[PDB]
Design a protein around this ligand. Structure first.
Ligand SMILES: *[C@H]1OC[C@@H](O[C@@H]2OC[C@@H](O)[C@H](O)[C@H]2O)[C@H](O)[C@H]1F
Length: 185
């Protein structure tokens, strides 16, 4: 599928050189950053979407995530399906696990306080995560069958909102440097 949304958000810290590439392709080259999230995908997310990507470069130097990323409203929820990471593997309150696309992912909830969101600069909101139990190899085509994650989240009382906001395949970083290159479809 063609992507129609370009995500390029930095909290202003350090350098985030994000290149909006041909089609579904993008790169990020980052240096000593605050928090940032860059990626490609769709203006309207869906729990029924299938997301494919190929990460031709995955070279974080420190804390970075290669991750499906998006939001809902009613309620406001920032969510992740993390397939690979740098030095830090993101964890939180353990809920259970889900098998999807040849991987097994731990399921977590965390909360952010006084943090940027789609609806304000100082917001408190829940985060939902599926984090793969081992890093997914990169450089071959990969698929995130997101309905498998949504259903698993539901089966643990993690209910997404009714009003879907954007949904991308992202590189997110904090307090780190590195390079990524990702094609999404
Ligand atoms: C999850 O990722 C980073 C940040 O989300 C951003 O909030 C500001 C909004 O304009 C952007 O669209 C988001 O990427 C959020 O604080 C963090 F929890």
């Amino acid at each position: 599928a063609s992507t129609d949304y370009w995500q390029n958000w930095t909290d202003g810290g350090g350098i985030v050189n994000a290149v909006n590439g041909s089609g579904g392709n993008y790169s990020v080259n980052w240096s000593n950053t605050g928090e940032f999230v860059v990626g490609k995908g769709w203006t309207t997310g869906s729990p029924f979407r299938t997301i494919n990507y190929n990460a031709g470069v995955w070279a974080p130097n420190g804390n970075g995530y290669l991750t499906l990323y998006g939001w809902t409203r009613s309620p406001l929820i920032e969510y992740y399906v993390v397939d690979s990471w740098g030095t830090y593997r993101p964890t939180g309150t353990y809920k259970g696990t889900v098998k999807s696309d040849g991987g097994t992912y731990d399921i977590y909830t965390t909360t952010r306080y006084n943090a940027p969101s789609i609806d304000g600069d100082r917001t408190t909101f829940t985060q939902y995560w599926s984090v793969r139990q081992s890093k997914r190899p990169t450089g071959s085509n990969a698929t995130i069958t997101f309905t498998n994650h949504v259903n698993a989240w539901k089966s643990h009382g993690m209910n997404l909102g009714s009003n879907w906001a954007y949904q991308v395949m992202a590189t997110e970083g904090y307090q780190s440097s590195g390079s990524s290159n990702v094609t999404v479809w």
